[PDB]
Amino acid sequence: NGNFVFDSPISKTLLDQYATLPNEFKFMRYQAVTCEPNQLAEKNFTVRQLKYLTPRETELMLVVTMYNEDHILLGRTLKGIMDNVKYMVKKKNSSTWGPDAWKKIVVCIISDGRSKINERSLALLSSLGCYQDGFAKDEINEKKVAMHVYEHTTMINITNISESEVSLECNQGTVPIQLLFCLKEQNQKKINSHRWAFEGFAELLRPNIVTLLDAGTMPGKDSIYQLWREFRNPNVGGACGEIRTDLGKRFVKLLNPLVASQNFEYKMSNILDKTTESNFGFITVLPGAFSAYRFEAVRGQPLQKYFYGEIMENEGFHFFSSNMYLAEDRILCFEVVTKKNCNWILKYCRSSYASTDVPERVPEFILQRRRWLNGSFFASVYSFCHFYRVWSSGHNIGRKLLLTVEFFYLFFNTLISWFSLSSFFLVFRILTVSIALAYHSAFNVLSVIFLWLYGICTLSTFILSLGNKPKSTEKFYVLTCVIFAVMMIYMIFCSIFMSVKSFQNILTEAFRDIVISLGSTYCLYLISSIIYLQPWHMLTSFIQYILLSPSYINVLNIYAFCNVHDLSSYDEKKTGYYANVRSLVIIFWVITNFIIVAVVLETGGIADYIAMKSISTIPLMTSKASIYFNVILWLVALSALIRFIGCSIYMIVRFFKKVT
Amino acid sequence: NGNFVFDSPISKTLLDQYATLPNEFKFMRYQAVTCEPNQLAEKNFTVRQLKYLTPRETELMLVVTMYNEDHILLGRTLKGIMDNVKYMVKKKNSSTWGPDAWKKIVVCIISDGRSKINERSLALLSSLGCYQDGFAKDEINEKKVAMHVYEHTTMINITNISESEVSLECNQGTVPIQLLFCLKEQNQKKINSHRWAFEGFAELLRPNIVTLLDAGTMPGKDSIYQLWREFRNPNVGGACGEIRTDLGKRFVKLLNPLVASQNFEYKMSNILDKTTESNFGFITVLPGAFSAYRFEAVRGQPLQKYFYGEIMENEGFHFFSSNMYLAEDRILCFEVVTKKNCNWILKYCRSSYASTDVPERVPEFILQRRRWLNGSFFASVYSFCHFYRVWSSGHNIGRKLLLTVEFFYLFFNTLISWFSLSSFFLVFRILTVSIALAYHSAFNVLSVIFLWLYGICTLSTFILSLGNKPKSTEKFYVLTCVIFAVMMIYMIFCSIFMSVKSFQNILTEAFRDIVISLGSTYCLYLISSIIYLQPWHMLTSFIQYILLSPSYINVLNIYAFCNVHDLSSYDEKKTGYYANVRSLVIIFWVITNFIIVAVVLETGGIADYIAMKSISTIPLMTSKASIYFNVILWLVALSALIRFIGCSIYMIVRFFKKVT
Ligand SMILES: NC(=O)OC[C@H](O)[C@@H](O)[C@H](N)C(=O)N[C@H](C(=O)O)[C@H]1O[C@@H](n2cc(CO)c(=O)[nH]c2=O)[C@H](O)[C@@H]1O
Ligand SMILES: NC(=O)OC[C@H](O)[C@@H](O)[C@H](N)C(=O)N[C@H](C(=O)O)[C@H]1O[C@@H](n2cc(CO)c(=O)[nH]c2=O)[C@H](O)[C@@H]1O
């Protein structure tokens, strides 16, 4: 049909394994694609699934993305998938998953560039019988090729994963898998790969559900099946399973403090936040590593906004229309909820889990968090600045009201997180000075030293994040984290010391109240973990996270706000606009935080002004500090309480549904 | 000789003008150079000057550098040169400059790249008969050409410069000029352009004196001749004239405040600093726009250090060995003074002047000053960190001692300038608070507002200089300068107000002393200007400079320290080292200044610590502020006094030499 195709018989050894035979098992198809993803249909590109005498009906289509992963991570992910399909076909009382479930299940593996792909994994892929060199063409009839499509259905299954080798076997218990290997001619953006999946192949495949995976992610032994079960309600359009750190063999990785704190964080985010948000019906972010979308729900407006942005735009740049790309993923969720005349919702099913690797060194950790913080902030402001769209959807009145209250709660979250830095120093200074004034022994020298340490660390972090890169200077970041850990240790010691002394004296008072409130939040965390029935997470070095806490409050935030856009003709004007908007958020951040600090501690000449106005007719401490300190933990207790109540509701309805 | 040469007869019209005739007048030589500058000799490249039957003896060789200048600036510079040579030949009583003195002089014009050269000026050059297209070759016998050499001796002289057109004429009063047009095949560093002059052509030309000019610089009607006269002393090896800001026709540019302040600065630097430094015998910097070097003195070690750097170096990077390039020009001066077994000195002759254009908009002004500030700081630290070399030279003991004391004085200059920012804010705060405490009327609100304004401006400048570029954001810099001008206005008003009130009361006291000292420095400036016999410069909007002063103290310095290296395999390691060293000077700067501010104003918890130590047994102001404020103007008066004394000595010896 004017296009280049090539069929090469499957490896004779692989054919012998298959024997251990209809045409699709014995051969590999190769197609060369030279168009952008949205011409696969009418430019006469096809797949085997439609070439049979009776076209195959796709019930699930699976996508995984590779950039440079070695064969271990990919092997693990496909081990999970093949196990899950084996359980799928093993089901008896399921028409969707009977003797030939894989007939309705095809797995697509989206590479990114031959140059950066790890041939170390191409070895395994060739072992599976879906990849052979020799017939790769970079340009066809003066048309540059866009992607290579390799297409085979194997019989070999992965069965064990050792730290070094990948165990594959072919027996009578194996289950056929339909493969779709796509190799982008050159390395491209992950969103482009998603477009190749959604805007492209999915259109021909006509799938009922599309699940986004990620190389190195472990589906549970039945997590995919459970996720599919969640879609029996005709209202859900997206869903996501709990994601936990893969830790290490015999939990060895749990030695690393960073891994320990990250583990506790992953657990919390999946115990309070997601259950609370899924109670209302809107989830802030579906993890890109593991998510599922009903295809018909997402087509149209969502993919438009995701791949193109707000088309309605003049020649000049606008804030949203040229900044929404930093919330690339989150916007999808928003767009499905408030679609016109459609009542789609999102759901969080806790019993489908996935274990993933995490960054292990400070540079990679920071370079990862940066994207997440920027995306979260931009998506939150975009959602709150356009919430009225929810009233233009097809929801009933109750859903609409619940979505409204949820939006207000989320904006309260983003605002309280915006002024976190000011509270951090404001609290530390108040407690340190309070105790030093109280007892006089040796906190006096300590107070001065700690203040200087915090100032130098805060400044140096600003300078380094604005000018330098994390890769060049790794030692200083580790030292900064250590210093913040020491400061947090001293803060806790002061708190407990004052609490004990005040208890003896009653045998100040607001600090007895603060220890009440801190005990309250810790006990509520414990109860929340107890309800979920995974209470060893609190024992997973949660204290290690507490020590690293200050770092996240005074290091991740500064870097995230100091590297907003990652800058490097129309291009120069765009770069100038990006640089201008980057250096304008930071100044606002510092000024707004310092306004609170000045109002409370009475620095910046305010004390001098007050004292000398009274002369017209300075103190060491005022009641303002006491009031502020009471208020901050008032708020912390409130947040913990509302989140605990939400978690209980989610678990209660989940259990009640199980009872029914 | 295995090389490509090409002779084309001079324009017939130009030939007719010449008639209005020996061979060198009637033809243009063209040579193609394909080696690096230090093979012009032994790779058999020659020039006409040596091709005559009796080789011509070069008494002066002149170099001018072009990057993109239009025909006006170049035309002005060559107008100056031809006038000066006309006066040179017009001289009667001289053993050297006779009727054929022009033959002993050759002018070399070093371009930089065909791509960026202004063909708008190539028009004028072709008019002069030293440039014709058609026979340009970019590569000769698989060897890339390095430079095009065009060679002619004209008879036309420039006679008037209108804002639009260049008046050229050919009459009986014109004087022949020997030209050497060297258009670099590709644009490159100006130092590389100089490398072609000194390490290259000069070796064949064997000149007695080489004068560095710059496109757009006006030699005086006799400045070149005077500069040559300065070399009759067999000890001088370099000398420089005096640069005057171009006020423009009827001082039209003067209206611009920036031009006015720059004019006053150019005058001062040439009235106190250079005369004082030339009294001892070492000049900090010979202006690249206008300078003169005795060739034999500079050959050897100086060009080695200038073009290559400290060869003695390991694989790793060292501070000096890889940072000296930022003081590219200044080092030359140092190297001539402390040459081994040579007693060369530098001299400053005031009566040779040169008028040049200056940057007129804030972005270009800042992008210019940056290089000067970085070069000055690095050269000063390099000189003071290696001063013992002076004792290894061939000077007598008296010269050696004078050079020692001068080096100490220069390091005192660089140190006092290093802690200028801290003094700026420290003084402003002390005066504003002092007055506000004094009188209570409305300085109270003003004091608080001014403090906040300074803080925001200082912060915003830090952020913008670290992250952004001056080109993108021009408006904010102008606003910053305006704000600093307003702050300086208020500072002056407070000073005079307190002085007047204290005078009435005596009809605090340290501030009566400060007004004494400020009157002292202003009157010493006036007397210094009076002695030099150019006292209209004080009337050239010197007050406009005073208003812009704060800006230079709190804007030029921050940008200079925040863009030290201009960063953008061995290259990546080098870039990492540059980025590391860049972000380490800044932190030192801030910490050292804030240490002074904390010690004096007693901020940073020091007051809290003192008060609560006394509790173990805070004020609004202490005597420390009074002591510091007295000391700072003590120092300012000292500097003004020593500089005035030096200026007088220079003028006295100059006059005495004239008397003798
Ligand atoms: N909560 C949660 O997300 O889990 C953690 C999450 O799994 C991470 O830990 C996980 N290691 C991870 O980074 N996955 C990436 C992602 O999808 O974001 C995958 O995208 C692919 N990719 C990415 C880029 C740069 O964006 C590219 O240029 N090309 C490209 O191909 C690549 O295959 C990468 O693996
Ligand atoms: N006190 C004092 O110096 O006077 C002020 C001084 O004259 C300035 O105002 C004067 N406008 C000026 O900038 N002259 C430059 C200089 O010599 O530094 C000349 O160097 C040339 N050049 C420069 C670069 C970049 O460095 C290049 O890449 N290529 C290149 O050819 C260029 O011809 C430029 O004109």
Residue numbers in the entry:
A (entry chain B), B (entry chain A): 382 to 401, 409 to 895, 908 to 968, 1027 to 1075, 1087 to 1129
According to the publication:
Chitin is a long-chain polymer of β-(1,4)-linked N-acetylglucosamine (GlcNAc) and is synthesized by chitin synthase in the plasma membrane. In this report, we determined seven cryo-electron microscopy (cryo-EM) structures of S. cerevisiae Chs1 in the apo state and in complex with UDP-GlcNAc, UDP-GlcNAc+GlcNAc, UDP, UDP+GlcNAc, PolyB, and NikkoZ. The overall structure of Chs1 reveals a dimer architecture with a twofold symmetry and is ~100 Å tall and 110 Å wide. Each Chs1 monomer is composed of a large cytosolic soluble region and a transmembrane domain (TMD), with both the N-terminus and C-terminus in the cytosol.
The nucleoside moieties of PolyB and NikkoZ are the same 5-aminohexuronic acid N-glycosidically bound to uracil. In contrast, the peptidyl moieties of PolyB contain carbamoylpolyoxamic acid, and NikkoZ contains hydroxypyridylhomothreonine. We determined the structures of Chs1-PolyB and the Chs1-NikkoZ complex at 3.6-Å and 2.4-Å resolution, respectively. Comparison between Chs1 maps in the apo and inhibitor-bound states revealed clearly elongated extra densities corresponding to PolyB and NikkoZ in the active site, consistent with their function as substrate competitive inhibitors. The nucleoside moieties of PolyB and NikkoZ are stabilized by T453, M454, Y455, and K578 at the top of the active site, which are the same residues interacting with the nucleoside group of UDP-GlcNAc. In contrast, unlike the flexible GlcNAc moiety of UDP-GlcNAc extending away from the active site, the peptidyl moieties of PolyB and NikkoZ extend toward the chitin transport channel and form extensive interactions with E457, D602, A677, and W760. The unique architecture of peptidyl moiety makes the inhibitor locked inside of the active site of Chs1. Besides, the switch loop of Chs1 is open in our Chs1-PolyB and Chs1-NikkoZ structures. Notably, end part of the peptidyl moieties of PolyB and NikkoZ occupy the GlcNAc acceptor binding site, and thus block the chitin transport channel. Therefore, our structures suggest that the peptidyl nucleoside inhibitors inhibit chitin synthases using a unique mechanism: the nucleoside moiety competes with UDP binding, and the peptidyl moiety induces the switch loop open and blocks the gate of chitin transport channel.
